[PDB]
Amino acid sequence: PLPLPEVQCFVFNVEYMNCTWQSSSEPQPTNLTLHYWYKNSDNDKVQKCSHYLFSEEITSGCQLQKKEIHLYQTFVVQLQDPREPRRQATQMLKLQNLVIPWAPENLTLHKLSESQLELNWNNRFLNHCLEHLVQYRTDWDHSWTEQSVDYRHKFSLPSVDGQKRYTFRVRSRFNPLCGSAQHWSEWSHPIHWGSN
Amino acid sequence: ITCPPPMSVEHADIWVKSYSLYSRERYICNSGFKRKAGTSSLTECVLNKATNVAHWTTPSLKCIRDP
Amino acid sequence: MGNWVNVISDLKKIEDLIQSMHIDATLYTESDVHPSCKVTAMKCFLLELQVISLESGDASIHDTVENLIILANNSLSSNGNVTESGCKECEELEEKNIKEFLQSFVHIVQMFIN
Amino acid sequence: SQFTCFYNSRAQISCVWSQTSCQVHAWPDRRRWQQTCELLPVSQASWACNLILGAPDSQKLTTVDIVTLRVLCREGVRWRVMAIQDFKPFENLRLMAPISLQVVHVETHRCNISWEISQASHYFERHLEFEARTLSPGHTWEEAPLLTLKQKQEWICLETLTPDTQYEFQVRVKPLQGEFTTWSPWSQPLAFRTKP
Ligand SMILES: *[C@@H]1O[C@H](CO)[C@@H](O[C@@H]2O[C@H](CO)[C@@H](O)[C@H](O)[C@H]2NC(C)=O)[C@H](O)[C@H]1NC(C)=O
């Protein structure tokens, strides 16, 4: 019995969830089926995917809407090959570890004092469920300088080279107060300060 | 230095692997019984430093009817 | 938030402390909490936490467990007199090792925080 | 006239009393223990002593705890309560000064300096902030700009320094929690030189 591809699910900002799988490496082209339910709760009924995703004219994923998302009850997906029913796979996922928030937005800088800067931003998400990573660099820097930030979502730079141009960017993660996701959001739109 | 046979716990049994000092043993609730939550089945051979005799620690284990 | 956030911190401290220890006790563990029975499940976690304290023989464990319980109970008292029904007894739960127990403990606390 | 106490977030409560044998008594609302320290003169008009609740890094109190603090002074054959306070520990935090200051790397115009914090409760997580200041050759400590770190960042990279120059560096720490919470004392100054 040829092994089915692994299903990877991510909950994007708790607005929807894409559950995808690599459609390639399959000898015969097939539309794989996906069913799902949640353990315990009142959602333990087998659901058919109501929104299949397609890559190269075959099923490559499934999308669930917000109302079908339950972070704190185990999510169960069943992938199956309709042409060979024996090929069936079940995965049990913890969605609170699989939340990926949207990138932070509205980055702003303001002068706290001489040669001191404060970076602020917004997230389209409940604040305390997020941690952050701030990165900055000058045009001379080989790589980014970074510093972790918690749910306060502020950042101060106490020593600034006034002769150099800085770039700031921030990303966010659903960790560790409401879940323990390892993956980070994409980087925010960057902003600049000063000039060379 | 060895410990004497442990005192019995109601509706439980114990099969000691070692009676020697510092040994950790565990009571097992009988069939049709469960360890009460919040109570421990652990006992160990410690030393009464005042009297130089070894005794098993008194377990907090309460074996209740299987719900 | 608040108290539960501190509860998370204490849970993480317990996880750290027990690493260098040999606590092979099995503990009643609700890994799949029903929202209608979340308070009942929480109280079972709090009860079983005492077993870890007793079996540890460690002062830092004693303090932290005692601290956690104080913090947790303070939040559960603020949750009102909401009674839950048709919930399992703690002894009806699956038994698991300290690792899985603590992991599921974190899981339910995160649920309360959110 | 004044009875002021601070909790170090672990197992010490430092008390000062202003106004002949006196002491501070600690009576917690939900712990089995009680604590006492003999008030000693630190000036002509002030007395002080530390309530030791346990080992240096033990967690002896939480935000739920309320400790009744009393100043007791012997007056003949009789003791009297001179001051009383229902101490909410996490509303009156003052940490130990940052320790273990060291230069990570020094250049001609730049210097990265790191430090650690002492006896800070794990309850804080990353909910902390720091302030630093640099002593310059022709100036004094009071003239030194307060550098602000609004996140738990245990290092600072001083920019725009002068080559072949002696500097001194201090840092202090404060939790974000607590109405009466104040800054830690300044750390011991760290002396360093920029490269020629
Ligand atoms: C979740 O899956 C959906 C559906 O595949 C993705 O939406 C697609 O995004 C790109 C944008 O060019 C295109 O393939 C389609 O226009 C979109 N399909 C739609 C809207 O049905 C979406 O990008 C995925 N989300 C994330 C963050 O990966």
Ligand SMILES: *[C@@H]1O[C@H](CO)[C@@H](O[C@@H]2O[C@H](CO)[C@@H](O)[C@H](O)[C@H]2NC(C)=O)[C@H](O)[C@H]1NC(C)=O
């Ligand atoms: C200054 O030195 C500090 C201490 O080494 C650096 O902070 C470390 O950075 C690395 C890489 O991000 C982290 O993995 C460590 O956890 C950090 N240590 C501490 C104590 O936070 C810092 O990157 C240096 N600053 C610059 C500008 O080079």
Ligand SMILES: *[C@@H]1O[C@H](CO)[C@@H](O)[C@H](O)[C@H]1NC(C)=O
């Ligand atoms: C997969 O499903 C699509 C949509 O129903 C269909 O058009 C396509 O022919 C299918 N491919 C197969 C059966 O290999």
Ligand SMILES: *[C@@H]1O[C@H](CO)[C@@H](O)[C@H](O)[C@H]1NC(C)=O
């Ligand atoms: C970003 O800023 C705009 C106003 O310029 C605002 O409308 C929007 O809500 C902000 N985004 C967030 C996440 O707050």
